Structure 1
Amino acid sequence: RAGRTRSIGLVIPDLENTSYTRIANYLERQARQRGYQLLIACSEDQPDNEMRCIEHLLQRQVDAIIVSTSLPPEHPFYQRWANDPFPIVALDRALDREHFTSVVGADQDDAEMLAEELRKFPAETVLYLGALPELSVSFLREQGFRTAWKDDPREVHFLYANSYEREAAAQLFEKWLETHPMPQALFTTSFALLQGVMDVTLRRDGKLPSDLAIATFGDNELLDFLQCPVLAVAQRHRDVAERVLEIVLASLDEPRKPKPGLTRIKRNLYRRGVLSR
């Protein structure tokens, strides 16, 4: 009755993806310290499931909802709250810049940062293995890569898989090797795509060779088991969770609400492989 539950909804695809769980982990920790209960609802990245998760959280009267939406930004479902005190804050994937605050990545800047450091290696063959070129995220990462290499004299091969997947990249990378030599510099826009070339580089060269510079999005601590140079960008998961919660709490308790639009948070570049020494 015009009160609050001191609870926050969080709609994400699942509690499996390495990146979403890390942010949820810090989000839960920082919210409980502030006296808020997180109400996690997993959509499995399906639109119909997400919209039901939103309505169930509303039924439980959460004070706000943090959502990583599977819909287009101005899909009309979220426009229901376009001019509404109820705070809906987008995470990772953006809502309408006009009416919602979204904490998102800086994929173009991240890729230029990651590509530039890969350009430091003077390798002759360079491969850019990506996926789903028609997606805005794929384009931004490609635009960032090309910006770092606009004046580099080397030809860069661009190879796009049809899904951000392990086995998909594996068979794409093998047919590509029937026609070209193995690259001396590799650039993957997803760490799953890098797994795919491994199952080829294992099934072909037996080992994984050195004298090969890898740059990738995502990150594993098992990237340190690589004797070749490996560069990698990963989200500042706890900075992102902090910023999201700042926006939620500011929308709830403070007179001048946060302004709508995108707030981007850069990734950190980590030096794996022989680089770590």
Structure 2
Amino acid sequence: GRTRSIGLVIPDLENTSYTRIANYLERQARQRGYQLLIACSEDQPDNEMRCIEHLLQRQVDAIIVSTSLPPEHPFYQRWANDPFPIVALDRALDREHFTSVVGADQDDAEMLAEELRKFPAETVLYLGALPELSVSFLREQGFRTAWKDDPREVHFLYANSYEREAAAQLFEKWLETHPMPQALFTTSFALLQGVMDVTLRRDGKLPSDLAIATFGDNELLDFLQCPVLAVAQRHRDVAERVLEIVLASLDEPRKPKPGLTRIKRNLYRRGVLSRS
């Protein structure tokens, strides 16, 4: 009854994090005799639900999804007590009913923020997005823990989306009344790209006196002239775990106990720190 196929619904194959996870999931699925069917949602809920339906129509045996919807959204509640495996990747689904393989956001932000705090800097800027979301709050809580005994006042700035242009416009507006920071903590690589876009437009280069700490990573940051700290997901491990959950959900009498499986990120020392 098994088509030996597994759906993967992710926003795109642009974002390095998503391409890397797709890369490893495809490799590992093929090694177990499964064809991955990738369907990109463009991070849009209506598209995502359409992709889900299309994959069901193609009779995939299971679906791995990074959802753009709230974790408890009714659309997925259809599968809450059903044999059909839906496994969440990166962004959680209802921990009562689904297994989600996600980051250890609070801990990872604390670990990154503790490293950032080691750089002398008068002006410290925290740039996040969508502060009301659980994920955003957890990252800020981790940062605050790391900085709780530091006497510096940190500037908090929040974009309306985790998106490069939104960050650029907000940071550019911020610079009208604040100095360039000497320490910067960004909660997504897209936010950091917007800041870097403005800094390059304004100055033609990054300051040597700027310590950058970001979620997300790109080994090309090794070539920047300022200190850069980055936290990347353990893509290979996440892929192996998700597949193992999908196959256990198919191969065993009972599904894995629902809940979050939080996988720590790696901290990478980039920019001038790669030349220490």
Residue 249 of structure 1 deviates from its aligned partner by: 0.6
Give the 3 Å change call, closer, same or farther, for CA 152–89 of structure 1 in structure 2.
same
Give the 3 Å change call, closer, same or farther, for CA 249–152 of structure 1 in structure 2.
same
Matched residues in 2 for 1:67 and 1:229: separation?
Answer: 35
Farther off after superposition, 157-166 or 196-205: 196-205
Farther off after superposition, 261-270 or 130-139: 130-139
Farther off after superposition, 85-94 or 40-49: 40-49
The superposition leaves residues 90-142 of structure 1 with CA deviations (integer Å, 9 ceiling, x where unpaired) of 11111111111111112111110100011111222211111221222211111
* Stretches of structure 1 lacking an aligned partner (at least 5 in a row): none
Residue 161 of structure 1 deviates from its aligned partner by: 2.1
Residue 84 of structure 1 deviates from its aligned partner by: 1.2
Matched residues in 2 for 1:176 and 1:7: separation?
Answer: 48
Residue 11 of structure 1 deviates from its aligned partner by: 1.3
- RMSD value, Cα: 1.5
Give the 3 Å change call, closer, same or farther, for CA 172–238 of structure 1 in structure 2.
same
SS, match of residue 146 in structure 1: helix
SS, match of residue 74 in structure 2: coil
Give 1:231's match in structure 2, choosing from 219, 226, 229. Answer: 229
Residue 49 of structure 1 deviates from its aligned partner by: 2.0
* Stretches of structure 2 lacking an aligned partner (at least 5 in a row): none
Give the 3 Å change call, closer, same or farther, for CA 57–158 of structure 1 in structure 2.
same
- The answer on 1:115 being equivalent to 2:126 is no
The superposition leaves residues 235-277 of structure 1 with CA deviations (integer Å, 9 ceiling, x where unpaired) of 1111100000010111111234211011111111100011012
Give 1:197's match in structure 2, choosing from 162, 183, 195. Answer: 195
Residue 77 of structure 1 deviates from its aligned partner by: 1.4
Matched residues in 2 for 1:47 and 1:169: separation?
Answer: 22
Q: Give me the TM-score of the superposition, normalised by structure 1.
A: 0.94
Give the 3 Å change call, closer, same or farther, for CA 96–271 of structure 1 in structure 2.
same
Matched residues in 1 for 2:61 and 2:155: separation?
Answer: 49
Residue 62 of structure 1 deviates from its aligned partner by: 1.4
Residue 15 of structure 1 deviates from its aligned partner by: 1.9
Percent identical among aligned pairs is: 100
Residue 193 of structure 1 deviates from its aligned partner by: 1.7
Matched residues in 1 for 2:123 and 2:225: separation?
Answer: 19
Matched residues in 2 for 1:49 and 1:221: separation?
Answer: 32
Residue 229 of structure 1 deviates from its aligned partner by: 0.5
Give the 3 Å change call, closer, same or farther, for CA 42–198 of structure 1 in structure 2.
closer
Give the 3 Å change call, closer, same or farther, for CA 60–202 of structure 1 in structure 2.
closer
The answer for the alignment partner of 1:133 in structure 2 is 131
SS, match of residue 2 in structure 2: coil
Matched residues in 2 for 1:171 and 1:46: separation?
Answer: 22
Count of paired positions: 275
Residue 171 of structure 1 deviates from its aligned partner by: 3.0
Q: Give me the TM-score of the superposition, normalised by structure 2.
A: 0.95
Within 5 Å, which residues of 2 pair with 1:234-249? 234-249=232-247
The superposition leaves residues 164-208 of structure 1 with CA deviations (integer Å, 9 ceiling, x where unpaired) of 222322232233222222211111112222222223322333332
The superposition leaves residues 37-64 of structure 1 with CA deviations (integer Å, 9 ceiling, x where unpaired) of 1111222222222222222222222111
Residue 16 of structure 1 deviates from its aligned partner by: 1.9
Matched residues in 1 for 2:266 and 2:88: separation?
Answer: 21
Give the 3 Å change call, closer, same or farther, for CA 80–273 of structure 1 in structure 2.
same
